[PDB]
Amino acid sequence: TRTVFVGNHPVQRFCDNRIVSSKYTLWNFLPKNLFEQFRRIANFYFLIIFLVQVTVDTPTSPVTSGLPLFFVITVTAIKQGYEDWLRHRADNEVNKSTVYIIENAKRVRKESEKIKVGDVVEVQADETFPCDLILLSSCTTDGTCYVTTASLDGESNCKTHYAVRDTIALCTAESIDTLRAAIECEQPQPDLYKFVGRINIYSNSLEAVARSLGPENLLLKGATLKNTEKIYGVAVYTGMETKMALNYQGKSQKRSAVEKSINAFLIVYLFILLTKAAVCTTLKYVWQSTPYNDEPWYNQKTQKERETLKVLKMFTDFLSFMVLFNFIIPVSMYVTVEMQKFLGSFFISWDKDFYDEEINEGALVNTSDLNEELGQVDYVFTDKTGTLTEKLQDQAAETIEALHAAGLKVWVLTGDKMETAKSTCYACRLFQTNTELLELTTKTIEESERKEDRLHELLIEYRKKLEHQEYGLIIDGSTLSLILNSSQDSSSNNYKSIFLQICMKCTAVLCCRMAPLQKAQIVRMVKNLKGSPITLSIGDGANDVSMILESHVGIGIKGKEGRQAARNSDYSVPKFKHLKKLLLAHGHLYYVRIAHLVQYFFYKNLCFILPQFLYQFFCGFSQQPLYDAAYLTMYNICFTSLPILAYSLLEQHINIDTLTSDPRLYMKISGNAMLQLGPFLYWTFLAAFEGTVFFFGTYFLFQTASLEENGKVYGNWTFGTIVFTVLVFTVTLKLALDTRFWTWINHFVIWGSLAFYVFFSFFWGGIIWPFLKQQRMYFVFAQMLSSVSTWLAIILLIFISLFPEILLIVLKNVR
Amino acid sequence: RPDNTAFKQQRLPAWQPILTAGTVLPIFFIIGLIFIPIGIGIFVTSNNIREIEIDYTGTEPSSPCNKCLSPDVTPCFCTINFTLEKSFEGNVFMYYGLSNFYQNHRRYVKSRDDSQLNGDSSALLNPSKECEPYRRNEDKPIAPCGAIMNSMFNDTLELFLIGQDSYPIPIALKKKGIAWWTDKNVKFRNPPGGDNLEERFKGTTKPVNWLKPVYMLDSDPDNNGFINEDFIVWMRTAALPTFRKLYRLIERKSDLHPTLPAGRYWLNVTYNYPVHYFDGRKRMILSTISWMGGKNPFLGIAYIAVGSISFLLGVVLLVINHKY
Ligand SMILES: *[C@@H]1O[C@H](CO)[C@@H](O)[C@H](O)[C@H]1NC(C)=O
């Protein structure tokens, strides 16, 4: 379809060898990064609430609500800018390189990104090709060349491509002799094994030689040349069209399995907050309809609240209620998760078990956002040569047994022929003796609709009737290519459906002769089939870098080939016997900590802002915050935001020395259990109960007219302080009951939170500075605890609140 | 080479507690055994405390002074007979409650300038702009600004004991000792300028609803301005639509006779504060005090219920837990 002129001479519209893998342009990084960030539902609600606080009314200071929204936007943006500059600087080293070309009867040396379609390139021994050449000649006769495609298929066996026959005579000898030629090729395709072209070399006067081309004459990019002095090609594909840059697909934005449940929780609390605000406003304007409940001769708007329009004050009051019940959704659950992840990614790096003495290095964490997804994996799309076999690895069999025991389903997407990738798999225990292979290789599917009947015979009458451990499939790049690319022929009986059912119903699967992209197609179908089974992929070489970018958490291994598939991996382990300890002892703990941190960061604020709403019924719906103006600001900062951080950062749900010895445990947190609809309603019905107990059990306590032996009344700030003491004590004792790994830091931080709450209540009230425009809470906390019935009421409430947990323990224990 | 610090290797020393059925069950019995006695204690103490509430808001011709539910702009009086069945022995405290008086409103709980009431020479002549619209009257600043101090409760309640004969006997009511010590001694101080009070408030003006400036509340040199016990106990907000502010302290006699012997009394009230507009009700609560505070049954019932529902649940789980 495309006509290229070998000598480029008569008798343009194509890219010039510029691989561009980056995403953000240097100039428009911000106008794109901020628009990609502020599209989310959380990072935009935070901005709406910040603007409302700055415009209409704020109980707290605007800074304590818009300062976190800056540390969260400046840190994620810096992360993304750096992981983009890395690919910028890594593509700069692939372009702007040295590649010699025969410009005009001489050997000019340009930069790889300046090569245009249709010019005789040159390549010395052991040089990655600059572009998809077409072997034209060679210093030696026979027109042969020994290419080793280590960066495409991933195997290192010496292939051999034959140069054009009639052109073997051109070896630096007048190769610029207006060489008549015109290669009519086909549009660029990712097949990597099919290429149909033709040469039309013209002689002195005119020639009609038409030497049809094939895959034997095609020299892809990224295939080092072995055992040869020099060659001569003619770039046919170059830049974003070569067969090595066609099998990339690009990198998607990876979001953990938790960062979606946090988003569902936030989208439910948005509705809870809106319901609270709307119901409070409606009840406020149904209450102020009584002539004498607004301005009853003892408090009267000056003139502005009398003249202000009716329909604008309704909106201003709705906004005041929203801003006042702002705390339901915590912006302190992101500035905390940042630190949690940044500090938790170090325990995967330092761990002394990830140390290989040969290479003398350890693990590596390239992204700190997928830690919480090491304990959710369901599949493992391995790679045969280099990862499994280096003669299997040290423990390449016991690790696969541990990965079959924990519930995972290990596949093998290799790149070698079916003859050898089958024997190894038969040694790794992936194929036991009594495993009836369902071989769908191209050696048995020599037809178009034949495999159509193969799939029916296999599914509708062989396997779909069920013995779940007997069958193990096998495929090739010639059969799966049809199965997938031609999956738009039948829709009443979908091919891809029949095939995916067979694959997901077998014990283990294999795939021989797999091009780089077909791996990403398999790991893109598996990510979509029937929900979202979290997939994993563990490659070693620069050909796996596609499924490592398409999987959910792509683990990369640091092997003999190089660091081209480790620097694009979300992690790094220099072995395969590590993939057990990595995703059994570091996935379980990380997911447990993150799930409990989220559940608690939502419960600790619902229980905090429920009373501050219930109170609106005993006020005149006037938006009077029950608590003081310093407690609303300090709760999430110092009072109860210290403990959960230390818990999330160091707490073993189950001692790790037992997590890796019994891989059965990984099945308790497999289906995202710890954040499903069950526990989310157990934590939203514990907060919505403690937040009513606190309030009403203090309200009933204030029906006595006095609480001191000397008979003195208590204001409306002692209401707030009693409820806040009860609240802090309860939401710290809940975590002190939930924590089951008590280090020297957990005792310290937990008990220190309570001791500091007490000392701060004492020190904030008791000294007039004065720099406060108001003396509301001067001596409230001392005169409050100077009574004998207050201690008793509080010790009764901190137990009526913790009753549900102590009961669930005693019941979720026996039977 | 490998950094083996016992912290980084995730192998710190831990407690790893094991709490379950056989180790928490005795807790559901200790709770009951330590919550039933305290429950009965604070339900008998809150039961042996006497009090009385004499509403005198009027609202019905059948009241002693419904005559003043709609009177002329002059001082009013009542006489609300009340009788005590069993006299009071300890110290007796006289409160004055209200109803449907939202002293916790937002537009109301902030209507005050704390710097001023704390005695800031500057603020005394330039109160803040939050205590509006009671900030300045007659192009001058009000001494106590804000809607809180403006609407102070200005009723006068007085008890008279009717002895064997019709001669009414007055009772000793002391005003000192009703406001928090912390605040009256420190939070509320008179302006520093000079010693005599009338010259400290030079650019000031009594509140609008008030009838006498702040330097004439009481002649007593220690109860004269910005620290008047009643004024303070009113400047503390209510926290609910129905509150009860300490009014006077009746001291127990030296003799063993009851502070308020049983019989009939007179409640001579100088009606001034009108609370019929907003469907409110005033009343006088005469009550004694005990170690834990006034008469309130809640705490007792709550402790008893918690102790019992802990003991019963513990026994139930113990029976079933033993049953396996
Ligand atoms: C008492 O206060 C009320 C309400 O502010 C006021 O209307 C009345 O005139 C006052 N009466 C006095 C000062 O005796």
Ligand code: ALF
């Ligand atoms: F063994 Al491979 F890509 F097939 F590393």
